[PDB]
PDB file of all heavy atoms in Angstrom:
ATOM      1  N   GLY A 293       2.861 -12.037  -0.628  1.00 14.49           N
ATOM      2  CA  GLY A 293       3.429 -11.209  -1.697  1.00 14.49           C
ATOM      3  C   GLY A 293       4.853 -10.790  -1.443  1.00 14.49           C
ATOM      4  O   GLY A 293       5.720 -10.884  -2.337  1.00 14.49           O
ATOM      5  N   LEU A 294       5.162 -10.364  -0.185  1.00 15.92           N
ATOM      6  CA  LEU A 294       6.511  -9.973   0.164  1.00 15.92           C
ATOM      7  C   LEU A 294       7.482 -11.126   0.162  1.00 15.92           C
ATOM      8  O   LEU A 294       8.604 -10.976  -0.258  1.00 15.92           O
ATOM      9  CB  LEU A 294       6.475  -9.310   1.548  1.00 15.92           C
ATOM     10  CG  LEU A 294       7.213  -8.039   1.922  1.00 15.92           C
ATOM     11  CD1 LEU A 294       7.275  -7.029   0.761  1.00 15.92           C
ATOM     12  CD2 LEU A 294       6.520  -7.466   3.161  1.00 15.92           C
ATOM     13  N   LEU A 295       7.016 -12.264   0.699  1.00 17.52           N
ATOM     14  CA  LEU A 295       7.962 -13.469   0.674  1.00 17.52           C
ATOM     15  C   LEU A 295       8.228 -13.888  -0.737  1.00 17.52           C
ATOM     16  O   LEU A 295       9.364 -14.376  -0.961  1.00 17.52           O
ATOM     17  CB  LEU A 295       7.338 -14.599   1.489  1.00 17.52           C
ATOM     18  CG  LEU A 295       7.216 -14.325   2.952  1.00 17.52           C
ATOM     19  CD1 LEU A 295       6.295 -15.381   3.611  1.00 17.52           C
ATOM     20  CD2 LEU A 295       8.583 -14.331   3.673  1.00 17.52           C
ATOM     21  N   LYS A 296       7.324 -13.749  -1.611  1.00 18.13           N
ATOM     22  CA  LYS A 296       7.536 -14.118  -3.023  1.00 18.13           C
ATOM     23  C   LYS A 296       8.668 -13.296  -3.666  1.00 18.13           C
ATOM     24  O   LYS A 296       9.379 -13.814  -4.521  1.00 18.13           O
ATOM     25  CB  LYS A 296       6.242 -13.911  -3.830  1.00 18.13           C
ATOM     26  CG  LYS A 296       5.218 -15.018  -3.512  1.00 18.13           C
ATOM     27  CD  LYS A 296       3.825 -14.597  -4.036  1.00 18.13           C
ATOM     28  CE  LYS A 296       3.773 -14.567  -5.575  1.00 18.13           C
ATOM     29  NZ  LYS A 296       2.369 -14.611  -6.057  1.00 18.13           N
ATOM     30  N   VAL A 297       8.832 -12.027  -3.231  1.00 17.85           N
ATOM     31  CA  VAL A 297       9.795 -11.171  -3.900  1.00 17.85           C
ATOM     32  C   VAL A 297      11.107 -10.947  -3.159  1.00 17.85           C
ATOM     33  O   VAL A 297      12.021 -10.337  -3.643  1.00 17.85           O
ATOM     34  CB  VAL A 297       9.198  -9.777  -4.265  1.00 17.85           C
ATOM     35  CG1 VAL A 297       8.114  -9.929  -5.362  1.00 17.85           C
ATOM     36  CG2 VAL A 297       8.671  -9.068  -3.016  1.00 17.85           C
ATOM     37  N   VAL A 298      11.155 -11.530  -1.954  1.00 16.93           N
ATOM     38  CA  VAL A 298      12.462 -11.380  -1.235  1.00 16.93           C
ATOM     39  C   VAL A 298      13.519 -12.205  -1.911  1.00 16.93           C
ATOM     40  O   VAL A 298      13.255 -13.343  -2.412  1.00 16.93           O
ATOM     41  CB  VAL A 298      12.276 -11.763   0.241  1.00 16.93           C
ATOM     42  CG1 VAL A 298      11.903 -13.231   0.334  1.00 16.93           C
ATOM     43  CG2 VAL A 298      13.564 -11.562   0.958  1.00 16.93           C
ATOM     44  N   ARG A 299      14.700 -11.627  -2.044  1.00 21.33           N
ATOM     45  CA  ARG A 299      15.857 -12.379  -2.513  1.00 21.33           C
ATOM     46  C   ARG A 299      16.404 -13.254  -1.404  1.00 21.33           C
ATOM     47  O   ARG A 299      16.924 -12.707  -0.367  1.00 21.33           O
ATOM     48  CB  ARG A 299      16.982 -11.420  -3.036  1.00 21.33           C
ATOM     49  CG  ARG A 299      16.532 -10.589  -4.233  1.00 21.33           C
ATOM     50  CD  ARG A 299      17.636  -9.817  -4.893  1.00 21.33           C
ATOM     51  NE  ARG A 299      18.445 -10.638  -5.822  1.00 21.33           N
ATOM     52  CZ  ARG A 299      19.654 -11.075  -5.547  1.00 21.33           C
ATOM     53  NH1 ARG A 299      20.256 -10.772  -4.382  1.00 21.33           N
ATOM     54  NH2 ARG A 299      20.253 -11.826  -6.434  1.00 21.33           N
ATOM     55  N   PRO A 300      16.291 -14.550  -1.501  1.00 22.71           N
ATOM     56  CA  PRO A 300      16.536 -15.424  -0.355  1.00 22.71           C
ATOM     57  C   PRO A 300      17.948 -15.367   0.167  1.00 22.71           C
ATOM     58  O   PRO A 300      18.093 -15.451   1.410  1.00 22.71           O
ATOM     59  CB  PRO A 300      16.198 -16.823  -0.913  1.00 22.71           C
ATOM     60  CG  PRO A 300      15.327 -16.581  -2.062  1.00 22.71           C
ATOM     61  CD  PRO A 300      15.766 -15.264  -2.688  1.00 22.71           C
ATOM     62  N   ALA A 301      18.972 -15.180  -0.659  1.00 24.72           N
ATOM     63  CA  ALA A 301      20.360 -15.238  -0.150  1.00 24.72           C
ATOM     64  C   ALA A 301      20.644 -13.989   0.707  1.00 24.72           C
ATOM     65  O   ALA A 301      21.491 -14.111   1.617  1.00 24.72           O
ATOM     66  CB  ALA A 301      21.300 -15.293  -1.297  1.00 24.72           C
ATOM     67  N   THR A 302      20.027 -12.852   0.457  1.00 26.10           N
ATOM     68  CA  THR A 302      20.274 -11.610   1.147  1.00 26.10           C
ATOM     69  C   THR A 302      19.124 -11.185   2.092  1.00 26.10           C
ATOM     70  O   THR A 302      19.295 -10.301   2.953  1.00 26.10           O
ATOM     71  CB  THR A 302      20.579 -10.491   0.196  1.00 26.10           C
ATOM     72  OG1 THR A 302      19.413 -10.323  -0.627  1.00 26.10           O
ATOM     73  CG2 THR A 302      21.770 -10.796  -0.684  1.00 26.10           C
ATOM     74  N   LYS A 303      17.969 -11.828   1.897  1.00 26.71           N
ATOM     75  CA  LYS A 303      16.720 -11.407   2.550  1.00 26.71           C
ATOM     76  C   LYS A 303      16.356  -9.935   2.282  1.00 26.71           C
ATOM     77  O   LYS A 303      15.710  -9.257   3.136  1.00 26.71           O
ATOM     78  CB  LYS A 303      16.833 -11.671   4.116  1.00 26.71           C
ATOM     79  CG  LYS A 303      16.827 -13.147   4.439  1.00 26.71           C
ATOM     80  CD  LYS A 303      16.855 -13.380   5.987  1.00 26.71           C
ATOM     81  CE  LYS A 303      16.839 -14.860   6.376  1.00 26.71           C
ATOM     82  NZ  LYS A 303      18.073 -15.566   6.013  1.00 26.71           N
ATOM     83  N   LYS A 304      16.703  -9.439   1.109  1.00 25.67           N
ATOM     84  CA  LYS A 304      16.390  -8.090   0.734  1.00 25.67           C
ATOM     85  C   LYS A 304      15.216  -8.044  -0.309  1.00 25.67           C
ATOM     86  O   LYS A 304      15.143  -8.945  -1.159  1.00 25.67           O
ATOM     87  CB  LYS A 304      17.586  -7.351   0.192  1.00 25.67           C
ATOM     88  CG  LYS A 304      18.541  -6.899   1.258  1.00 25.67           C
ATOM     89  CD  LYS A 304      19.719  -6.204   0.713  1.00 25.67           C
ATOM     90  CE  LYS A 304      20.420  -5.428   1.761  1.00 25.67           C
ATOM     91  NZ  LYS A 304      21.486  -4.568   1.155  1.00 25.67           N
ATOM     92  N   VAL A 305      14.425  -6.980  -0.283  1.00 24.14           N
ATOM     93  CA  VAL A 305      13.448  -6.738  -1.286  1.00 24.14           C
ATOM     94  C   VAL A 305      13.874  -5.454  -2.015  1.00 24.14           C
ATOM     95  O   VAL A 305      14.323  -4.505  -1.319  1.00 24.14           O
ATOM     96  CB  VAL A 305      11.984  -6.577  -0.771  1.00 24.14           C
ATOM     97  CG1 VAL A 305      11.513  -7.951  -0.179  1.00 24.14           C
ATOM     98  CG2 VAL A 305      11.841  -5.446   0.269  1.00 24.14           C
ATOM     99  N   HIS A 306      13.753  -5.443  -3.325  1.00 26.96           N
ATOM    100  CA  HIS A 306      14.284  -4.426  -4.175  1.00 26.96           C
ATOM    101  C   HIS A 306      13.055  -3.905  -4.977  1.00 26.96           C
ATOM    102  O   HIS A 306      12.745  -4.418  -5.997  1.00 26.96           O
ATOM    103  CB  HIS A 306      15.393  -4.956  -5.078  1.00 26.96           C
ATOM    104  CG  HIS A 306      16.569  -5.477  -4.329  1.00 26.96           C
ATOM    105  ND1 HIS A 306      17.677  -4.666  -4.006  1.00 26.96           N
ATOM    106  CD2 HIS A 306      16.847  -6.690  -3.863  1.00 26.96           C
ATOM    107  CE1 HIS A 306      18.576  -5.374  -3.410  1.00 26.96           C
ATOM    108  NE2 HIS A 306      18.126  -6.595  -3.220  1.00 26.96           N
ATOM    109  N   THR A 307      12.489  -2.781  -4.454  1.00 25.61           N
ATOM    110  CA  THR A 307      11.363  -2.196  -5.219  1.00 25.61           C
ATOM    111  C   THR A 307      11.939  -1.495  -6.450  1.00 25.61           C
ATOM    112  O   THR A 307      13.122  -1.324  -6.649  1.00 25.61           O
ATOM    113  CB  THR A 307      10.602  -1.213  -4.328  1.00 25.61           C
ATOM    114  OG1 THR A 307       9.355  -0.829  -4.962  1.00 25.61           O
ATOM    115  CG2 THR A 307      11.414   0.043  -4.076  1.00 25.61           C
ATOM    116  N   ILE A 308      10.978  -1.100  -7.339  1.00 28.65           N
ATOM    117  CA  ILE A 308      11.297  -0.207  -8.459  1.00 28.65           C
ATOM    118  C   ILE A 308      10.472   1.048  -8.260  1.00 28.65           C
ATOM    119  O   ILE A 308       9.247   0.931  -8.190  1.00 28.65           O
ATOM    120  CB  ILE A 308      11.081  -0.839  -9.799  1.00 28.65           C
ATOM    121  CG1 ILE A 308      12.189  -1.864 -10.083  1.00 28.65           C
ATOM    122  CG2 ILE A 308      11.010   0.279 -10.918  1.00 28.65           C
ATOM    123  CD1 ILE A 308      12.027  -2.688 -11.384  1.00 28.65           C
ATOM    124  N   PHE A 309      11.146   2.185  -8.169  1.00 31.13           N
ATOM    125  CA  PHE A 309      10.414   3.486  -8.072  1.00 31.13           C
ATOM    126  C   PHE A 309      10.137   3.988  -9.492  1.00 31.13           C
ATOM    127  O   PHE A 309      11.105   4.425 -10.149  1.00 31.13           O
ATOM    128  CB  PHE A 309      11.197   4.519  -7.292  1.00 31.13           C
ATOM    129  CG  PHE A 309      11.199   4.194  -5.754  1.00 31.13           C
ATOM    130  CD1 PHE A 309      12.404   3.741  -5.182  1.00 31.13           C
ATOM    131  CD2 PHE A 309      10.092   4.438  -5.024  1.00 31.13           C
ATOM    132  CE1 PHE A 309      12.341   3.521  -3.771  1.00 31.13           C
ATOM    133  CE2 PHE A 309      10.129   4.149  -3.640  1.00 31.13           C
ATOM    134  CZ  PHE A 309      11.259   3.713  -3.006  1.00 31.13           C
ATOM    135  N   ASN A 310       8.971   3.910  -9.961  1.00 30.36           N
ATOM    136  CA  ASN A 310       8.610   4.472 -11.285  1.00 30.36           C
ATOM    137  C   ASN A 310       8.633   6.001 -11.225  1.00 30.36           C
ATOM    138  O   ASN A 310       7.816   6.583 -10.517  1.00 30.36           O
ATOM    139  CB  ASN A 310       7.278   3.936 -11.722  1.00 30.36           C
ATOM    140  CG  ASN A 310       7.111   2.511 -11.375  1.00 30.36           C
ATOM    141  OD1 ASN A 310       6.299   2.099 -10.536  1.00 30.36           O
ATOM    142  ND2 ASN A 310       7.963   1.695 -12.006  1.00 30.36           N
ATOM    143  N   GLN A 311       9.568   6.590 -11.914  1.00 28.32           N
ATOM    144  CA  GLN A 311       9.750   8.073 -11.872  1.00 28.32           C
ATOM    145  C   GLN A 311       8.988   8.794 -12.986  1.00 28.32           C
ATOM    146  O   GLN A 311       8.912  10.003 -12.972  1.00 28.32           O
ATOM    147  CB  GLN A 311      11.235   8.353 -11.919  1.00 28.32           C
ATOM    148  CG  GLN A 311      11.667   9.771 -11.544  1.00 28.32           C
ATOM    149  CD  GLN A 311      13.126   9.996 -11.742  1.00 28.32           C
ATOM    150  OE1 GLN A 311      13.880   9.050 -11.994  1.00 28.32           O
ATOM    151  NE2 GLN A 311      13.598  11.235 -11.713  1.00 28.32           N
ATOM    152  N   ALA A 312       8.425   8.057 -13.948  1.00 25.72           N
ATOM    153  CA  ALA A 312       7.828   8.701 -15.085  1.00 25.72           C
ATOM    154  C   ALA A 312       6.459   8.213 -15.346  1.00 25.72           C
ATOM    155  O   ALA A 312       6.057   7.973 -16.520  1.00 25.72           O
ATOM    156  CB  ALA A 312       8.726   8.521 -16.340  1.00 25.72           C
ATOM    157  N   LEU A 313       5.660   8.030 -14.277  1.00 27.55           N
ATOM    158  CA  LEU A 313       4.339   7.422 -14.359  1.00 27.55           C
ATOM    159  C   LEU A 313       3.229   8.346 -13.884  1.00 27.55           C
ATOM    160  O   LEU A 313       2.219   8.497 -14.591  1.00 27.55           O
ATOM    161  CB  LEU A 313       4.306   6.064 -13.587  1.00 27.55           C
ATOM    162  CG  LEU A 313       3.033   5.272 -13.591  1.00 27.55           C
ATOM    163  CD1 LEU A 313       3.317   3.790 -13.380  1.00 27.55           C
ATOM    164  CD2 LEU A 313       2.029   5.698 -12.526  1.00 27.55           C
ATOM    165  N   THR A 314       3.309   8.913 -12.666  1.00 29.03           N
ATOM    166  CA  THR A 314       2.144   9.612 -12.158  1.00 29.03           C
ATOM    167  C   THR A 314       1.922  10.935 -12.814  1.00 29.03           C
ATOM    168  O   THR A 314       2.879  11.603 -13.304  1.00 29.03           O
ATOM    169  CB  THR A 314       2.233   9.858 -10.603  1.00 29.03           C
ATOM    170  OG1 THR A 314       3.126  10.898 -10.357  1.00 29.03           O
ATOM    171  CG2 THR A 314       2.656   8.529  -9.853  1.00 29.03           C
ATOM    172  N   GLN A 315       0.655  11.390 -12.817  1.00 27.32           N
ATOM    173  CA  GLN A 315       0.355  12.555 -13.548  1.00 27.32           C
ATOM    174  C   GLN A 315       0.635  13.886 -12.761  1.00 27.32           C
ATOM    175  O   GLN A 315       0.475  14.981 -13.342  1.00 27.32           O
ATOM    176  CB  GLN A 315      -1.153  12.573 -13.922  1.00 27.32           C
ATOM    177  CG  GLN A 315      -1.532  11.409 -14.836  1.00 27.32           C
ATOM    178  CD  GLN A 315      -0.670  11.397 -16.073  1.00 27.32           C
ATOM    179  OE1 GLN A 315      -0.835  12.336 -16.969  1.00 27.32           O
ATOM    180  NE2 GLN A 315       0.257  10.493 -16.175  1.00 27.32           N
ATOM    181  N   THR A 316       1.039  13.774 -11.532  1.00 26.59           N
ATOM    182  CA  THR A 316       1.342  14.877 -10.681  1.00 26.59           C
ATOM    183  C   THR A 316       2.826  15.098 -10.390  1.00 26.59           C
ATOM    184  O   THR A 316       3.207  16.065  -9.725  1.00 26.59           O
ATOM    185  CB  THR A 316       0.561  14.776  -9.300  1.00 26.59           C
ATOM    186  OG1 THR A 316       0.910  13.550  -8.709  1.00 26.59           O
ATOM    187  CG2 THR A 316      -0.928  14.806  -9.548  1.00 26.59           C
ATOM    188  N   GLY A 317       3.646  14.139 -10.768  1.00 25.89           N
ATOM    189  CA  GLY A 317       5.070  14.216 -10.438  1.00 25.89           C
ATOM    190  C   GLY A 317       5.444  13.366  -9.172  1.00 25.89           C
ATOM    191  O   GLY A 317       6.656  13.397  -8.880  1.00 25.89           O
ATOM    192  N   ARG A 318       4.519  12.763  -8.528  1.00 26.92           N
ATOM    193  CA  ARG A 318       4.890  11.732  -7.509  1.00 26.92           C
ATOM    194  C   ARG A 318       5.599  10.547  -8.182  1.00 26.92           C
ATOM    195  O   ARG A 318       5.461  10.273  -9.391  1.00 26.92           O
ATOM    196  CB  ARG A 318       3.643  11.183  -6.845  1.00 26.92           C
ATOM    197  CG  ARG A 318       3.023  12.135  -5.788  1.00 26.92           C
ATOM    198  CD  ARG A 318       2.036  11.382  -4.949  1.00 26.92           C
ATOM    199  NE  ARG A 318       1.644  12.141  -3.731  1.00 26.92           N
ATOM    200  CZ  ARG A 318       0.816  11.658  -2.805  1.00 26.92           C
ATOM    201  NH1 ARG A 318       0.418  10.457  -2.985  1.00 26.92           N
ATOM    202  NH2 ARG A 318       0.529  12.345  -1.734  1.00 26.92           N
ATOM    203  N   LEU A 319       6.343   9.847  -7.364  1.00 25.36           N
ATOM    204  CA  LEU A 319       6.831   8.485  -7.648  1.00 25.36           C
ATOM    205  C   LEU A 319       5.740   7.482  -7.410  1.00 25.36           C
ATOM    206  O   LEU A 319       4.733   7.703  -6.634  1.00 25.36           O
ATOM    207  CB  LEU A 319       8.019   8.131  -6.720  1.00 25.36           C
ATOM    208  CG  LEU A 319       9.200   9.058  -6.725  1.00 25.36           C
ATOM    209  CD1 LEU A 319      10.246   8.537  -5.670  1.00 25.36           C
ATOM    210  CD2 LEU A 319       9.863   9.247  -8.070  1.00 25.36           C
ATOM    211  N   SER A 320       5.841   6.303  -7.995  1.00 25.01           N
ATOM    212  CA  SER A 320       5.084   5.130  -7.571  1.00 25.01           C
ATOM    213  C   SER A 320       6.114   4.046  -7.362  1.00 25.01           C
ATOM    214  O   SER A 320       7.293   4.170  -7.643  1.00 25.01           O
ATOM    215  CB  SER A 320       4.030   4.732  -8.565  1.00 25.01           C
ATOM    216  OG  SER A 320       4.584   4.135  -9.734  1.00 25.01           O
ATOM    217  N   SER A 321       5.666   2.955  -6.631  1.00 24.47           N
ATOM    218  CA  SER A 321       6.598   1.920  -6.211  1.00 24.47           C
ATOM    219  C   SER A 321       5.997   0.561  -6.574  1.00 24.47           C
ATOM    220  O   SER A 321       4.781   0.380  -6.284  1.00 24.47           O
ATOM    221  CB  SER A 321       6.860   2.006  -4.669  1.00 24.47           C
ATOM    222  OG  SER A 321       7.412   0.811  -4.069  1.00 24.47           O
ATOM    223  N   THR A 322       6.805  -0.338  -7.168  1.00 26.44           N
ATOM    224  CA  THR A 322       6.205  -1.590  -7.718  1.00 26.44           C
ATOM    225  C   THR A 322       7.057  -2.779  -7.420  1.00 26.44           C
ATOM    226  O   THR A 322       8.280  -2.682  -7.434  1.00 26.44           O
ATOM    227  CB  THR A 322       5.926  -1.481  -9.208  1.00 26.44           C
ATOM    228  OG1 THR A 322       7.243  -1.335  -9.913  1.00 26.44           O
ATOM    229  CG2 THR A 322       5.069  -0.326  -9.600  1.00 26.44           C
ATOM    230  N   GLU A 323       6.383  -3.901  -7.157  1.00 23.92           N
ATOM    231  CA  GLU A 323       6.912  -5.284  -7.059  1.00 23.92           C
ATOM    232  C   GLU A 323       8.168  -5.373  -6.185  1.00 23.92           C
ATOM    233  O   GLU A 323       9.259  -5.661  -6.658  1.00 23.92           O
ATOM    234  CB  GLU A 323       7.238  -5.775  -8.444  1.00 23.92           C
ATOM    235  CG  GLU A 323       7.291  -7.294  -8.565  1.00 23.92           C
ATOM    236  CD  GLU A 323       7.532  -7.809  -9.979  1.00 23.92           C
ATOM    237  OE1 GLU A 323       6.641  -7.800 -10.835  1.00 23.92           O
ATOM    238  OE2 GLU A 323       8.710  -8.121 -10.318  1.00 23.92           O
ATOM    239  N   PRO A 324       8.006  -5.155  -4.849  1.00 24.73           N
ATOM    240  CA  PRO A 324       6.786  -4.889  -4.165  1.00 24.73           C
ATOM    241  C   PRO A 324       6.515  -3.349  -4.057  1.00 24.73           C
ATOM    242  O   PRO A 324       7.512  -2.537  -4.166  1.00 24.73           O
ATOM    243  CB  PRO A 324       6.980  -5.427  -2.807  1.00 24.73           C
ATOM    244  CG  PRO A 324       8.467  -5.201  -2.577  1.00 24.73           C
ATOM    245  CD  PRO A 324       9.137  -5.410  -3.885  1.00 24.73           C
ATOM    246  N   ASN A 325       5.277  -2.940  -3.833  1.00 26.81           N
ATOM    247  CA  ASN A 325       4.964  -1.621  -3.535  1.00 26.81           C
ATOM    248  C   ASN A 325       5.343  -1.362  -2.101  1.00 26.81           C
ATOM    249  O   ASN A 325       4.744  -1.962  -1.151  1.00 26.81           O
ATOM    250  CB  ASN A 325       3.487  -1.309  -3.833  1.00 26.81           C
ATOM    251  CG  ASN A 325       3.102   0.146  -3.494  1.00 26.81           C
ATOM    252  OD1 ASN A 325       3.861   0.847  -2.955  1.00 26.81           O
ATOM    253  ND2 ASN A 325       1.806   0.500  -3.813  1.00 26.81           N
ATOM    254  N   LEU A 326       6.374  -0.558  -1.812  1.00 24.04           N
ATOM    255  CA  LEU A 326       6.756  -0.319  -0.471  1.00 24.04           C
ATOM    256  C   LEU A 326       6.240   1.044  -0.034  1.00 24.04           C
ATOM    257  O   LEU A 326       6.623   1.549   1.048  1.00 24.04           O
ATOM    258  CB  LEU A 326       8.287  -0.340  -0.283  1.00 24.04           C
ATOM    259  CG  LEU A 326       8.895  -1.746  -0.511  1.00 24.04           C
ATOM    260  CD1 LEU A 326      10.409  -1.770  -0.329  1.00 24.04           C
ATOM    261  CD2 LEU A 326       8.223  -2.791   0.356  1.00 24.04           C
ATOM    262  N   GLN A 327       5.298   1.639  -0.789  1.00 23.44           N
ATOM    263  CA  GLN A 327       4.668   2.918  -0.366  1.00 23.44           C
ATOM    264  C   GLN A 327       3.279   2.698   0.192  1.00 23.44           C
ATOM    265  O   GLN A 327       2.574   3.679   0.456  1.00 23.44           O
ATOM    266  CB  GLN A 327       4.591   3.875  -1.555  1.00 23.44           C
ATOM    267  CG  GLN A 327       5.962   4.277  -2.148  1.00 23.44           C
ATOM    268  CD  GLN A 327       5.856   5.231  -3.300  1.00 23.44           C
ATOM    269  OE1 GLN A 327       4.974   5.070  -4.096  1.00 23.44           O
ATOM    270  NE2 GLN A 327       6.724   6.214  -3.319  1.00 23.44           N
TER     271      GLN A 327
END
């Protein structure tokens, strides 16, 4: 899963922190989930 989403030229993974999703005010992390 992680190898699929790494940007090959930089070897970086760039998650997205969903700030407006959880019902308690936590963040969630997607594609990849780094939490």
Side-chain angles (χ1 to χ4, degrees):
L294 223 38
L295 291 167
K296 288 164 67 164
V297 292
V298 62
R299 298 188 80 254
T302 59
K303 291 180 177 72
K304 283 178 163 190
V305 295
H306 299 270
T307 192
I308 286 176
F309 288 108
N310 318 113
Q311 194 185 347
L313 180 154
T314 75
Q315 299 305 291
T316 57
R318 285 192 167 185
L319 308 176
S320 73
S321 164
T322 63
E323 203 179 280
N325 179 353
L326 296 182
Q327 300 180 320

